[PDB]
Amino acid sequence: MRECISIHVGQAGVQIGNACWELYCLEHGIQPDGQMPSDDSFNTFFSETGAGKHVPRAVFVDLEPTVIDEVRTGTYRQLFHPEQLITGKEDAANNYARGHYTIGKEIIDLVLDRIRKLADQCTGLQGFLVFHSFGGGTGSGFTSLLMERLSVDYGKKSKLEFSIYPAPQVSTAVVEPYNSILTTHTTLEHSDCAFMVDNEAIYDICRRNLDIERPTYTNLNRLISQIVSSITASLRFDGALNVDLTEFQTNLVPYPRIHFPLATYAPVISAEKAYHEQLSVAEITNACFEPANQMVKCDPRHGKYMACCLLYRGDVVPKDVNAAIATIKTKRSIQFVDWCPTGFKVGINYQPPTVVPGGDLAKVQRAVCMLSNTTAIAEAWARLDHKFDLMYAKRAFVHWYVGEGMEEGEFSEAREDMAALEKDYEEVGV
Amino acid sequence: MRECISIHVGQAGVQIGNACWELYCLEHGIQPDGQMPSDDSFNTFFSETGAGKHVPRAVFVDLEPTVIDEVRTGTYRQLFHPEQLITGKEDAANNYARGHYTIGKEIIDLVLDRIRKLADQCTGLQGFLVFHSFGGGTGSGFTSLLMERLSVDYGKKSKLEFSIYPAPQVSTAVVEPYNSILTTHTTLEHSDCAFMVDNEAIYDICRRNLDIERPTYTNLNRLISQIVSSITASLRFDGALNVDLTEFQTNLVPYPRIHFPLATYAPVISAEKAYHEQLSVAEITNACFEPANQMVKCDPRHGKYMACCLLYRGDVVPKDVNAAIATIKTKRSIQFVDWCPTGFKVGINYQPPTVVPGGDLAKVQRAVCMLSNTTAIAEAWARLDHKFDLMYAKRAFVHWYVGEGMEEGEFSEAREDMAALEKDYEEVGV
Amino acid sequence: MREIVHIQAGQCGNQIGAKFWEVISDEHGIDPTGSYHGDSDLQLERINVYYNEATGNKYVPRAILVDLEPGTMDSVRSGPFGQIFRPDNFVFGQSGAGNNWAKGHYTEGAELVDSVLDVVRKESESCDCLQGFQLTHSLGGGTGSGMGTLLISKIREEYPDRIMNTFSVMPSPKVSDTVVEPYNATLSVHQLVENTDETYSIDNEALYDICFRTLKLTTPTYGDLNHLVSATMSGVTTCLRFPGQLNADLRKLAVNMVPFPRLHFFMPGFAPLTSRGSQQYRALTVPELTQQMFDSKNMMAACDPRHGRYLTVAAIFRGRMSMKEVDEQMLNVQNKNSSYFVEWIPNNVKTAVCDIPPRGLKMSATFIGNSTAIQELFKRISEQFTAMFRRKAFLHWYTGEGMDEMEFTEAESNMNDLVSEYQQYQ
Amino acid sequence: MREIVHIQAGQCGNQIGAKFWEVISDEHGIDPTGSYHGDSDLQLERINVYYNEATGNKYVPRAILVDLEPGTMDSVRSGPFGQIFRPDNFVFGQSGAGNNWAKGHYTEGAELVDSVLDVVRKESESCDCLQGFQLTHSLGGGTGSGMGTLLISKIREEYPDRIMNTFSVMPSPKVSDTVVEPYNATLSVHQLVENTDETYSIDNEALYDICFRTLKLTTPTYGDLNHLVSATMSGVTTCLRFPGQLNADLRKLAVNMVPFPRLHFFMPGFAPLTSRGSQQYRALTVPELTQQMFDSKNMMAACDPRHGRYLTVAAIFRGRMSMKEVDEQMLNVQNKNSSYFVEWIPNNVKTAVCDIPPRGLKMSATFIGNSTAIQELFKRISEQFTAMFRRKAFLHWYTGEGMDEMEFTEAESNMNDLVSEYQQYQ
């Protein structure tokens, strides 16, 4: 019942998985060895065997072994099914071309084989939670190949998309927009609701809120895990208003192509800071709409809200939710599209947030998960399109994509598709 | 009651016997000396004397002594009746010719003499379990001479055939197809149900499932022994649905000449792997039809199933068998011939599988023996016929067969017979 | 003897119906295990109205629990009185409706309607003389509004003559918790008007207004709103479970309360209502009950009656009281406030009195009203529908279920027709 | 006095008959060693019906255990009540039938029919007044279907006037465990229709459906299906072993239950049936027994009666009850469901009531039905036969036993003839 198969592609995907399962084993009380010391709250994410062992339903796919066989050496080496974590021989070279045609071709058939052997025990499979990065070669090419076959083998099943998106300023590779643009066909055609992750915005989040001067990506991971667990909170624990994963995405999506909502989490706050605040429902409600708390470097005040979903968890009373949202609709600075004078979807869960012992996040009795679609997010693509022009105008690095079996015009279809998406997110704002 | 005389011909036959009896003495609890420390469960395979000694009803026949007098030196030197294990003076030279006319002629009369002195104590003799290899000189020629006389002296008794069949790529001798083709008359005319064994497919099995990089043939043997014991499981132990050896072969055989079923065993799994799986009846049922688990390098998905026999053993409930076979008939990828919409024969036994202490196989509470006839297995002969042409087109090595008393045209009758068999297994698939 | 068969739809419906079961089990003195523990025999004669007699003198309520998710069934069975219910009436699917009316009415609930019908039919044949079906559900979301209307239509089809009364909690603008409520409400009232003989409209906002501005609760939870609903739930059927001087069962109300067949969405209310620290000071006399009863603050919907005219009002009083003051208040209310009651129909009040008051109460009053002002919620639902209808949002999640545009158009047209009839007589 | 001689054929037959022997030994209060241990004398007067009086006041059942393998004999003799049986009636071969009907009917069972006949004849001459033979066997495989029909034909030949009732577990498509069942079923029913006065059709799938969807057993084993069979096994012969107000022995059923001589394959059922945690809540009154009894879920074959018309139904009730409600339910069932019963024959029910209920039960009801819907299993068996008949598989294992093609053709023709007669009156 209510099972979800999590897919982890690329270095970013596999390591964000390492952090997510680190959070899940703690919140559901499983040791790193898979045992339960002493409700079926784990059936959503973990499978059970006769010996009392919790086996996650997850696949780690990387075209290179270093990160995954590092996982084979870490504390979670025995938690995972060893041959459901698949390693390739040749890295993706930050190239969508080989990852989509050349190197992922020989390995994808085993990946779908393991997906099938994960699906056949799920009696109530709810959806898919695939993790990757746009800029990475694996997270672009292999995901592009994989959602294609998943959409024809599991067409009815929902496919939530949690992807890591490049920053306006911070970047790790010059070819990142090339990988990002050929991913856009996958999210538009073979995804049901995509969640985009910006590293620089959350860098600002941890700089300002967590007061930590020197966090790593592991600190980024130990909050992406919270956002995904909060999205999955209603499926695993009891709540006064439990939101089904299908109910969720029906509430987000106004049109089949408009399914790209922003995400924010509250309260992101350090342990030294949690003490001096009462941390009411109202202020965590007010903090979410603050542009200084957005996960993507775009100003919501530059845009218009279409769908709003209040995913509260912990000791939160729905009356306080109504009182907060009355204030939210009271201010004019937050102007919603003329589509939704009802505005808000409310979801409340009884489980307080679970704290990572090595994390930088404080223990708070209340936590809220904010997921909202808005027209302001097109700016996060409005710099990437001008960016892609700035390389494609000479055919900057295409000889590699051409040399690995990509048609030259696939870039033309790519920027045509992103232009279509950018237009689609502008007409709905009128 | 329910006795079976096991025949072991050639090096492969005698050594697979050494492994089988190694398994049988452990599962029935007999020491290598033949004694019982402390039900008539052993009467199917072992004879009893007054002093409390278990004497196997088996013959080791090899035209050369090295392997058998090695058995005379091993831990089982005292288990066997010394002059029921027969040794020749001249090896078979991988040649069917001498083994069928020249060197086996002087020794076969003693072999049938010992077979008679093994038959005369069997009050309820059920059938024969003869082991050999197609490619070997002894396993071809001497078996060809022996089934001929057994079919006229024990015509009513069933003769199960467990033979080791060459691989599409892996081979140990150049003359192997020559020996294999002159064996085909024996299986068609003087055998009731033949079980073919491919070394390369099971090499892949032990490479993928057992995780062992460096097994020997002894690892091959310590699973052929399991397959034969599982086939004989119902005759020796109690079960809710015990399948008689005649009942078995009546369920396999649609026509007198179509009696060549494939075999697979589940769960083939290493000790480190047995822990993390619950290992339900369904998954061992699903694993058997997977082409990556077939004992012969042929794709069942390339062919059509005629008869299906579910030989479960251990802690298996028949309801779970019905639930599994409902799923099996649910998928379309497994298409059975229009002969058998009933599809499946079910056999359940209460004895869990017995583990070899030095083996590479894990201890599992449940085990299933899969035996099925299909039209896809003709491909395993569809490369051997083109193979035999590739030698016979010059008369490649016939001067030896001619020089040892074989008619030149016996090759012509041989490939005519294999062509007849190949046709026979194609018309039934319509 | 006038058996009444209860059906729960949606999480809202089954939890408020479960708390209603708790309340009337206390009124009838029924142990949580189902055994009888009441004090007087008066709790015992009309047990057959709500409960089935079984072995061991234990009593099982005649309730059918319907949902599309097992989680709500898990909560209700693990609730205070989960064990008293029938294991067979827990009829439920696995995949939820996702607040989709089309899912519940065509795909998700259509497969379970067969499994609910075979239970409701056996419950009805278990009855000696069936009177009707009291169904609890929510107009919000796609479970209660979706499958509830379908099975209501089915039971109306096969039971054409029995009383059909439904208590419906319905969406609201300021305390809306789901985006897609107006679609659900418009597609639900379409069937509610055509099939139901009786519908009680309940709005959450006025329940909140009651619990703050009258009950003075600092933290009234959702169960307190369930309690406010269950008070009138028990009140409306008091007369056919207990003796009283003026007996008025459901059809007694019906013949007096709905002038034209389609004007059957009504206004519930209950008295007395006090805070914890103010009940000590209040004089609970019947005239004061009346002055509290027709207050716009005592009602359970945002539709203020001063914006319309009452067609018919039902005041089912309860307790050991005489009745001349009952008549004098029921005439004074409609005389001094004759501008709020249709003068063209003179005596707008139906009076019923019961002899046994609620446990812990010396007296009680239950309010049922037909006001033309109830169109406030209907026209507002239609306006919000238009704000999400006129140019096509969210329709792919309905049309993907086989739903079609023209049926949405007819549903909106029927909302407009209803608000037209209710403004006609104002 | 109306002695009844039991014969077991096949492993299915002898194990279910052994568990039947266990059940009715508990009902008659017989110790596992064979001594009497019952409480009332009512268990004692009709001991002669099933058991033989012997020295020491111990009682040996009149059962003949027939098989072609010694393993089943070994299991039954080592079973809970193995010691009570006659060592002489363990008549058995050594080589099994291999699920071959021809083997059992021509070669393997023909040599043992002489050794079974000399035992059944001595058992019959040991009787004071023989009434019939109750034979348990399986239509699946070649032992129960194979030799069972042969010896049934022999006993019918030499006992032409005695009642012949057989309880036959018969093959099914989805819970089939053997490939060659349809041949066996077609070659068995050929003799069953011509010789047997009575045949009870039992299908394993509906036994599974009972144990999951009514009994709520998570792991109901094969012995639980044996128990479900043995319940009706004991019920059908209750009237001639115990007093009751309406006595109806086997021939009482026969004269009422089979309108034309060949329409004698019937529908067994038993009530009450509850899960462990639901018997505590159920009211075991006779009307509820009836509403459970004609349910399509209570039956023991996949043939849904709503796909046909009942010719005759037998309801042998048991326990200290009056009977006006018995008549009223037996008329209400055939009146409100008159579309499911042949209107052309008005009173389709035979009513029998016994005074002593089963041990631990205050009352019980046993269902026997003649529905035209029972052709569902017959035509499906014929269709599966055709899928393995029309172009020659598996026939070498029959024709090697002296079996011939034209007899298979006549067997299929007779299945078609039967399904024709049972569709004729639908």
Ligand SMILES: CC(=O)O[C@H]1C(=O)[C@@]2(C)[C@H]([C@H](OC(=O)c3ccccc3)[C@]3(O)C[C@H](OC(=O)[C@H](O)[C@@H](NC(=O)c4ccccc4)c4ccccc4)C(C)=C1C3(C)C)[C@]1(OC(C)=O)CO[C@@H]1C[C@@H]2O
């Ligand atoms: C000490 C004392 O006098 O306190 C009273 C009481 O009269 C007050 C405080 C009660 C009290 O009710 C509440 O506090 C309340 C809270 C949320 C929502 C609704 C009620 C009381 O709990 C409620 C309870 O009422 C009943 O028992 C009725 O029979 C009622 N049943 C229940 O309320 C009930 C409670 C728990 C479990 C099951 C039933 C009822 C009303 C209509 C129809 C059928 C039954 C009574 C007399 C009291 C307390 C205990 C404080 C009130 O309740 C009712 C329904 O009469 C709230 O306003 C009224 C009147 C009073 O102020």
Ligand SMILES: CC(=O)O[C@H]1C(=O)[C@@]2(C)[C@H]([C@H](OC(=O)c3ccccc3)[C@]3(O)C[C@H](OC(=O)[C@H](O)[C@@H](NC(=O)c4ccccc4)c4ccccc4)C(C)=C1C3(C)C)[C@]1(OC(C)=O)CO[C@@H]1C[C@@H]2O
């Ligand atoms: C405590 C209590 O009330 O439990 C009862 C009981 O009534 C229940 C649980 C019993 C119980 O039966 C089962 O659990 C069962 C399991 C698999 C297959 C069949 C039955 C009971 O075992 C069965 C047993 O019934 C009898 O003893 C009858 O005489 C029956 N004989 C046997 O079942 C039997 C059991 C063991 C050994 C020998 C006989 C019988 C029925 C028809 C004709 C002749 C005899 C009774 C009353 C009970 C228990 C003990 C729980 C039920 O059994 C019968 C046959 O009435 C199952 O549904 C019915 C009714 C009830 O739910």
Ligand SMILES: Nc1nc2c(ncn2[C@@H]2O[C@H](COP(=O)(O)OP(=O)(O)OP(=O)(O)O)[C@@H](O)[C@H]2O)c(=O)[nH]1
């Ligand atoms: N937020 C966040 N982003 C990450 C993390 N790890 C990698 N990324 C993103 O991944 C992008 C580059 O992709 P890669 O590092 O090459 O990883 P990959 O997806 O496996 O791609 P390949 O190495 O080519 O196979 C960077 O721009 C980062 O934004 C992480 O831990 N947190």
Ligand SMILES: Nc1nc2c(ncn2[C@@H]2O[C@H](COP(=O)(O)OP(=O)(O)OP(=O)(O)O)[C@@H](O)[C@H]2O)c(=O)[nH]1
């Ligand atoms: N699977 C398996 N095959 C074996 C084994 N031993 C021998 N064979 C097969 O035997 C074939 C060759 O036959 P030989 O090794 O010559 O044995 P032989 O049957 O005694 O023949 P001769 O030596 O000529 O008398 C090889 O191709 C192998 O496939 C074994 O232990 N396991």
Ligand SMILES: Nc1nc2c(ncn2[C@@H]2O[C@H](COP(=O)(O)OP(=O)(O)O)[C@@H](O)[C@H]2O)c(=O)[nH]1
């Ligand atoms: N008065 C009241 N309202 C509730 C309660 N629980 C939920 N609600 C509201 O009523 C609406 C009904 O929608 P819902 O029942 O969830 O839709 P469904 O799941 O399709 O049946 C929701 O939007 C809630 O905000 C309750 O206990 N009492």
Ligand SMILES: Nc1nc2c(ncn2[C@@H]2O[C@H](COP(=O)(O)OP(=O)(O)O)[C@@H](O)[C@H]2O)c(=O)[nH]1
């Ligand atoms: N209801 C029921 N069915 C059984 C039982 N045991 C076996 N069966 C099924 O009934 C069929 C009867 O065939 P079988 O008796 O084995 O053939 P036989 O050996 O020739 O008598 C088998 O295919 C089994 O699947 C049992 O205890 N109860």
Ligand SMILES: [Mg+2]
């Ligand atoms: Mg990488």
Ligand SMILES: [Mg+2]
């Ligand atoms: Mg050799």
